[PDB]
Design an enzyme around this catalytic site. Structure first.
Site, PDB file in Angstrom:
ATOM      1  CD  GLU A  42      44.013  54.510  98.418  1.00  0.00           C
ATOM      2  OE1 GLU A  42      44.220  55.638  98.919  1.00  0.00           O
ATOM      3  OE2 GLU A  42      43.757  53.497  99.102  1.00  0.00           O
ATOM      4  CD  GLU A  58      44.344  59.124  99.974  1.00  0.00           C
ATOM      5  OE1 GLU A  58      44.507  60.367  99.949  1.00  0.00           O
ATOM      6  OE2 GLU A  58      45.197  58.309  99.538  1.00  0.00           O
TER       7      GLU A  58
END
Ligand SMILES: O=P(O)(O)O[C@H]1[C@@H](OP(=O)(O)O)[C@@H](OP(=O)(O)O)[C@@H](OP(=O)(O)O)[C@@H](OP(=O)(O)O)[C@H]1OP(=O)(O)O
Ligand SMILES: O=P(O)(O)O[C@H]1[C@@H](OP(=O)(O)O)[C@@H](OP(=O)(O)O)[C@@H](OP(=O)(O)O)[C@@H](OP(=O)(O)O)[C@H]1OP(=O)(O)O
Lengths: 247, 247
Positions: free
Chosen positions: B146, B150
């Protein structure tokens, strides 16, 4: 250098004593879109400039603005700034340059490549409300009209403190910018100035996404994170407020 | 109460020692659109609720989002969140509810009136990067995947500090939210994380408008101006960083 142009704006620094924390606070407004986006849409650049130069323009847009340019729909871009304000002749002229610069050469594939490789994002400025005097309008009348037009705060909420005037000068290289600020002290409760921002008031939302009370710590925090330094105006203004109250 | 649902996200708090000011800093990301806008577009409200209730939803959108809703063009609204991500079946279902709630009764005049009378504007949250684990993915693998997805920061830039884990619980009334955070320390220079935000990386710009190093003063400044309190996670994280470095 040779200034080829002088641009004068007059504004109002409106201050309050917050009774809960005995902190001095001033009304600031945050802009709705970036200078870079505005400059791109009104074609204030050279199509002949080198790649790296045009990329810096895209770098300083926000992500949402870049995603709007990526659509290639000039009218969706235009709406972002103008919001259906009737300026068709300006619109058509700016569209013609967008079309010639970016659509006719290759139907937008250089523009998309630049838009795709731009890195980072700009910042929406906090500012003191201000504008251009109308014809034969006095400086104070301009500051007061502009304040009301942007924030919706009317004259019954504050008293002008006429001994204070602050002028600032900035030099573009050819444009001289003169900013003149008066000072007002709130004399009637107004705890949520942001509630005056509604879409039914086209002049408040035209260029503004937020209106807030800001204390000096916040003013300093903001000033260190944007190109527009607010301390040279708010610092003296708060100094004046402190002397006014201590008498 | 009766929690009818548990939602678990795992994230990474990545920290650095800034050598110029000897200040500890952490990567935060700012969201691109508001919770209110997302909730409105995906129809997470009741059309039967009272006016004042539906207005609070519009009050917490940004001005630009409200101006998008004012166009009545669901696809311009949808693009704002999804950016041409292929989710047609979700799209069609949400459009059907928008059409039935707001277009069929009066071709949008109640919606426009509400949009016009909403006051104020919401705020785009700063957050610690985090997401949902994939199937049979471990907690740490999720936080690392993640983070990279991002921010674009890859594993060669930091070392995980495995003794640190912070869990947070929030209760919606029926949904329980579990947020689990690991801690990483930068071991390779990365002075401008915001430069990793480009439109050619759809997963970075999908929900993010800015990536920045933030020191504790900034974390506190931000936390006092938004609903999401970051201090309960960053405070302990920086404490751990200080003990790690002092050994
Ligand atoms: O000569 P132009 O390039 O077309 O300049 C015009 C204009 O009118 P005149 O220039 O015909 O006087 C305005 O002038 P002022 O309003 O300042 O009097 C305007 O100002 P605004 O930005 O306030 O509209 C600014 O000319 P100026 O050089 O006087 O600012 C503007 O060109 P801009 O698009 O650069 O404003
Ligand atoms: O049952 P639904 O109302 O349709 O719930 C779904 C879904 O799958 P299942 O619910 O069929 O398991 C996902 O569940 P998880 O991904 O959490 O496993 C999802 O989660 P995401 O938000 O991460 O997509 C969330 O259900 P859950 O209650 O498990 O979160 C989602 O409904 P939402 O739209 O509320 O997410």
């Amino acid at each position: 250098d040779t200034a080829m142009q002088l641009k004068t704006s007059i504004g109002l620094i409106t201050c309050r004593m917050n009774t809960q924390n005995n902190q001095i606070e001033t009304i600031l407004v945050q802009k709705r879109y970036s200078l870079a986006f505005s400059e791109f849409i009104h074609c204030h650049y050279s199509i002949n400039a080198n790649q790296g130069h045009l990329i810096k323009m895209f770098n300083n847009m926000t992500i949402n603005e870049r995603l709007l340019v990526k659509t290639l729909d000039f009218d969706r871009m235009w709406y972002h700034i103008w919001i259906e304000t009737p300026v068709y002749e300006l619109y058509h002229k700016k569209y013609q340059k967008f079309r010639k610069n970016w659509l006719l050469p290759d139907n937008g594939k250089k523009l998309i490549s630049l838009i795709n490789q731009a890195k980072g994002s700009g910042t929406l400025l906090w500012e003191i409300p201000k504008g251009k005097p109308k014809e034969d309008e006095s400086d104070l009348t301009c500051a007061i009209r502009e304040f009301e037009e942007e924030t919706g705060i009317t004259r019954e909420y504050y008293q002008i403190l006429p001994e204070f005037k602050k002028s600032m000068s900035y030099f573009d290289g050819k444009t001289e910018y003169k900013h003149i600020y008066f000072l007002a002290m709130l004399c009637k409760s107004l705890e949520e100035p942001n509630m005056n921002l509604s879409l039914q008031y086209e002049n408040r939302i035209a260029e503004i996404s937020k209106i807030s009370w800001q204390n000096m710590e916040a003013v300093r925090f903001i000033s260190k994170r944007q190109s527009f330094n607010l301390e040279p105006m708010i610092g003296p203004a708060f100094n004046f407020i402190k002397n006014y109250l201590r008498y």
